[PDB]
Amino acid sequence: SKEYHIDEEVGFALPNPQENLPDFYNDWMFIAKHLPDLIESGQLRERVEKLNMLSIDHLTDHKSQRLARLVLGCITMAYVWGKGHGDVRKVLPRNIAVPYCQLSKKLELPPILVYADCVLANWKKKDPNKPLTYENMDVLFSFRDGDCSKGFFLVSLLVEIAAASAIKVIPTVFKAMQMQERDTLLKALLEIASCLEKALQVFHQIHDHVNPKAFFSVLRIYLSGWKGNPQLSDGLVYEGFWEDPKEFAGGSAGQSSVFQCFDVLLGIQQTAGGGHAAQFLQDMRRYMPPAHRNFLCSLESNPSVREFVLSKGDAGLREAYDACVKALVSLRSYHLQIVTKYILIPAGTDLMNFLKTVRSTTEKSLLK
Amino acid sequence: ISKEYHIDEEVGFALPNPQENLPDFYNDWMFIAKHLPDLIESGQLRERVEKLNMLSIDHLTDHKSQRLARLVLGCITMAYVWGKGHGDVRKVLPRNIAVPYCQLSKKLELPPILVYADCVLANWKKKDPNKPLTYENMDVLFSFRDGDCSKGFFLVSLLVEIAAASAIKVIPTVFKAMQMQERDTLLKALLEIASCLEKALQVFHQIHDHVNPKAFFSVLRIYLSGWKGNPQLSDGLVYEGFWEDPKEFAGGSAGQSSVFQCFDVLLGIQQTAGGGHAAQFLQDMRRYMPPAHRNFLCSLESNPSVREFVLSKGDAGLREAYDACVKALVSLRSYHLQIVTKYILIPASQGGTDLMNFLKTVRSTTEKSLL
Numbered sequence: 187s188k189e190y191h192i193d194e195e196v197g198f199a200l201p202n203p204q205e206n207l208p209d210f211y212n213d214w215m216f217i218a219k220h221l222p223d224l225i226e227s228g229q230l231r232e233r234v235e236k237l238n239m240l241s242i243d244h245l246t247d248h249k250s251q252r253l254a255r256l257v258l259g260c261i262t263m264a265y266v267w268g269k270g271h272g273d274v275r276k277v278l279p280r281n282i283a284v285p286y287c288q289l290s291k292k293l294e295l296p297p298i299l300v301y302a303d304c305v306l307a308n309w310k311k312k313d314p315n316k317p318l319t320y321e322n323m324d325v326l327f328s329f330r331d332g333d334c335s336k337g338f339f340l341v342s343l344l345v346e347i348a349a350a351s352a353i354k355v356i357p358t359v360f361k362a363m364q365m366q367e368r369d370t371l372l373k374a375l376l377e378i379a380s381c382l383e384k385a386l387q388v389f390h391q392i393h394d395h396v397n398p399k400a401f402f403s404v405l406r407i408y409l410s411g412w413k414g415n416p417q418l419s420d421g422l423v424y425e426g427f428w429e430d431p432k433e434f435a436g437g438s439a440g441q442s443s444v445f446q447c448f449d450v451l452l453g454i455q456q457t458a459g460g461g462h463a464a465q466f467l468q469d470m471r472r473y474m475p476p477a478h479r480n481f482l483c484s485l486e487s488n489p490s491v492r493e494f495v496l497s498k499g500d501a502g503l504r505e506a507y508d509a510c511v512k513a514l515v516s517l518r519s520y521h522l523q524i525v526t527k528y529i530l531i532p533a534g535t536d537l538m539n540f541l542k543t544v545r546s547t548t549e550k551s552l553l554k
Numbered sequence: 555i556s557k558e559y560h561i562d563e564e565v566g567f568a569l570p571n572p573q574e575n576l577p578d579f580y581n582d583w584m585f586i587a588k589h590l591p592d593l594i595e596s597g598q599l600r601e602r603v604e605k606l607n608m609l610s611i612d613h614l615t616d617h618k619s620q621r622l623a624r625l626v627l628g629c630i631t632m633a634y635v636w637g638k639g640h641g642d643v644r645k646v647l648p649r650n651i652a653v654p655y656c657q658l659s660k661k662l663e664l665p666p667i668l669v670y671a672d673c674v675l676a677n678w679k680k681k682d683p684n685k686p687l688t689y690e691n692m693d694v695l696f697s698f699r700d701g702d703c704s705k706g707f708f709l710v711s712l713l714v715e716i717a718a719a720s721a722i723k724v725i726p727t728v729f730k731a732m733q734m735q736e737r738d739t740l741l742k743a744l745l746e747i748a749s750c751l752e753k754a755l756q757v758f759h760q761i762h763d764h765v766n767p768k769a770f771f772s773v774l775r776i777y778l779s780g781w782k783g784n785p786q787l788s789d790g791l792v793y794e795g796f797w798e799d800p801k802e803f804a805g806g807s808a809g810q811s812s813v814f815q816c817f818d819v820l821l822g823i824q825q826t827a828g829g830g831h832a833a834q835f836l837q838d839m840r841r842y843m844p845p846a847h848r849n850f851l852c853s854l855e856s857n858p859s860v861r862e863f864v865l866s867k868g869d870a871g872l873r874e875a876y877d878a879c880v881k882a883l884v885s886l887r888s889y890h891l892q893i894v895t896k897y898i899l900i901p902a903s904q905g906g907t908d909l910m911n912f913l914k915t916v917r918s919t920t921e922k923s924l925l
């Protein structure tokens with residue numbers, strides 16, 4: 187569909203994002219395009235404080251509003267965390283905080299860098315006529331030299347794209363259930379598992395493009411927010427826009443709509459139950475684009491694919507459903523091996539118990 | 555016309571014509587629920603719950619019977635857990651009532667605890683079927699204690715839920731007028747909605763006639779509170795025979811009412827958006843609405859914003875019509891805010907003050923929505 191902003195080729199990713207803002211915002215674009223140098227030289231916070239308050243009125247369309255959210259978002263994290271060694275700022279200056287909050291209010295997103303900014307909207311094609319492959323793609327913004335932010339973002343983006351192939355089968359699933367078309371539903375579930383199995387092979391590229399100590403000690407710092415953070419115990423002051431400081435969670439892949447979408451489709455009660463994992467994945471929906479929030483909730487309004495398969499006494503239909511659940515377990519299991527390489531060894535123990543709980547919930551959803 | 559969603563033309567989100575009696579197979583359940591005041595005060599409610607046999611849910615054939623069974627099992631559960639309402643708490647719900655309550659709640663996609671849709675939307679009847687829906691012609695189906703003001707509290711909420719129903723049927727007219735670009739139809743629709751919300755404010759005044767501040771704070775409030783962030787059941791309540799761990803579920807609230815969230819969504823009042831505790835609370839309370847009412851709120855959020863439509867037109871008449879609805883929402887919460895001060899703030903001085911900071915936040919969000 188169209189009002190959910192789900193593309194045929196890139197799915198939840200923003201199709202063909204905008205790389206440049208109008209000349210009116212050149213003072214923004216220069217800072218965001220040179221974050222590794224302005225941070226390393228100890229001049230980023232000065233350049234930010236010298237900016238004049240630019241109006242968001244010249245951001246006329248959707249794509250340019252998403253780019254400015256990415257620009258202002260990357261500068262905010264660069265201003266709050268600085269060099270990423272402890273010298274923080276608990277007040278975001280109004281010349282960049284007021285337009286950030288105004289733009290975030292308009293796009294119904296929190297004023298902090300989220301997954302839909304630094305992954306779904308932070309990419310470009312090198313050559314337009316060539317396909318969406320890692321060698322033909324690039325990110326628009328980074329934080330530090332050697333933060334491996336290109337590999338981390340683009341590999342997440344590429345797994346998102348690989349999962350988009352399964353997203354377009356979803357309407358066939360619900361149509362087959364309503365029309366009681368058993369053979370069509372089986373073929374569709376097998377196709378959804380096939381696409382999720384291709385996405386697992388895409389995931390393997392993470393070792394080639396992401397370095398362990400680079401992600402743990404650099405990129406992770408600039409992606410963390412100010413909710414439950416001892417460094418900003420009461421949040422961030424959004425100067426000129428809010429009286430009190432506000433708390434917002436740093437970016438996450440719980441913000442990725444892809445995995446939440448198949449949890450709902452297959453009846454994997456991730457957001458139910460009551461655990462911290464349930465509440466966290468539920469809260470991270472507030473950090474998705476509004477169109478993608480509505481898509482997840484619209485899947486939850488449809489009849490359960492799980493209860494349909496359980497009620498038929500159909501072996502071939504339970505295996506096709508199990509192939510979809512199995513593909514989700516395979517992804518989170520391989521992803522769990524990635525987190526031990528990139529987080530546990532460089533170190534955190536709560537992340538494992540969170541991921542193991544999400545994976546545990548998925549594996550217990552199998553029928554055999 | 556709205557589909558279902560389960561929204562009535564006359565009573566809106568309330569259950570139309572609730573069932574008063576379960577089949578004979580469940581006579582052991584109905585006897586306890588119908589005699590809570592005597593069984594609680596005499597201290598023999600918990601015994602008669604424990605010597606119940608584990609009845610099956612298969613004999614609740616239709617929707618209205620399952621909603622009544624959710625109402626009776628919900629009232630017995632609060633009575634069992636809170637007892638006489640003075641501190642002696644049970645942390646274990648016996649299996650012969652825990653597993654049919656959880657089985658039935660699993661089927662209706664609701665959590666195993668009394669919610670607004672139980673004790674308000676499904677907890678009423680007409681005294682005379684032919685006479686209109688007024689306070690004098692209505693009555694609740696269940697109460698906790700004698701003098702808990704549960705009749706006046708449940709029916710006054712129910713009456714303004716009906717008063718809002720007149721504005722819910724105009725919602726399809728609002729979105730069709732935007733899609734088909736009918737400016738005059740939309741303006742008339744927004745004015746019709748604002749009028750109904752102003753009709754509902756007058757119904758709200760009956761709260762002083764039929765509710766007592768001391769009876770609500772010290773009696774009815776105890777039986778409606780739940781086991782989520784509660785120092786009396788810090789880990790939750792164990793539903794014996796169904797879950798091995800204790801589970802936390804929030805007490806009944808009017809944040810579970812769909813009418814006020816429904817108009818926040820329609821007017822683009824970003825209540826659930828933002829990071830505040832009030833935004834987190836109102837989103838969490840949707841998990842406590844009936845599934846058809848959850849899906850209706852979701853369906854509204856998927857439609858284009860009525861607010862951005864009115865802002866983009868440069869139309870003074872359209873803005874005044876949109877402002878009349880926001881003004882009507884501010885007037886309701888403001889009057890409701892003065893009710894809480896008489897019924898919660900003053901009895902507390904012989905949650906707490908967080909109830910006031912919560913309601914002032916949602917009112918401020920509604921008030922700042924003006925143009």
Ligand code: HEM
Nearest residue numbers: 341342345392396438439440442445518524525528537544
């Ligand atoms: C070096 C690579 C990666 C690291 C270090 C990493 C780390 C983490 C951590 C620590 C979490 C849980 C805490 C939190 O989300 O805040 C998480 C969650 C998640 N990650 Fe990753 N991740 C990596 C790659 C990926 C990729 C490429 C994807 C592609 C879709 C992905 C998908 C997810 C999802 C869906 C979640 C939410 C939890 C779940 O649904 O199981 N991760 N990641």
Ligand code: HEM
Nearest residue numbers: 710711714761765770807808809811814893894897909916
């Ligand atoms: C004694 C009379 C009343 C009292 C003491 C009372 C108290 C409260 C309190 C404390 C809250 C927010 C706290 C919470 O639920 O956890 C609340 C919310 C609410 N009440 Fe009431 N209430 C009363 C009557 C009514 C009536 C008649 C209605 C009409 C439906 C109503 C509608 C609501 C709604 C919709 C909310 C959600 C909060 C919001 O407006 O955003 N209340 N009430």
Ligand SMILES: O[C@@H](Cn1c2ccccc2c2ccncc21)C1CCCCC1
Nearest residue numbers: 300301304342406409436437438439537
């Ligand atoms: O890496 C993030 C989690 N996370 C993201 C955060 C922001 C933007 C994207 C992601 C992300 C993307 C894919 N997998 C995990 C992800 C971080 C979460 C807090 C603990 C360290 C790891």
Ligand SMILES: O[C@@H](Cn1c2ccccc2c2ccncc21)C1CCCCC1
Nearest residue numbers: 669670673674711775778806807808905
């Ligand atoms: O007043 C109730 C909230 N509440 C309900 C709870 C259960 C069922 C209905 C209601 C309700 C209905 C209207 N207003 C407030 C309401 C309670 C809120 C939490 C603090 C103690 C007082």
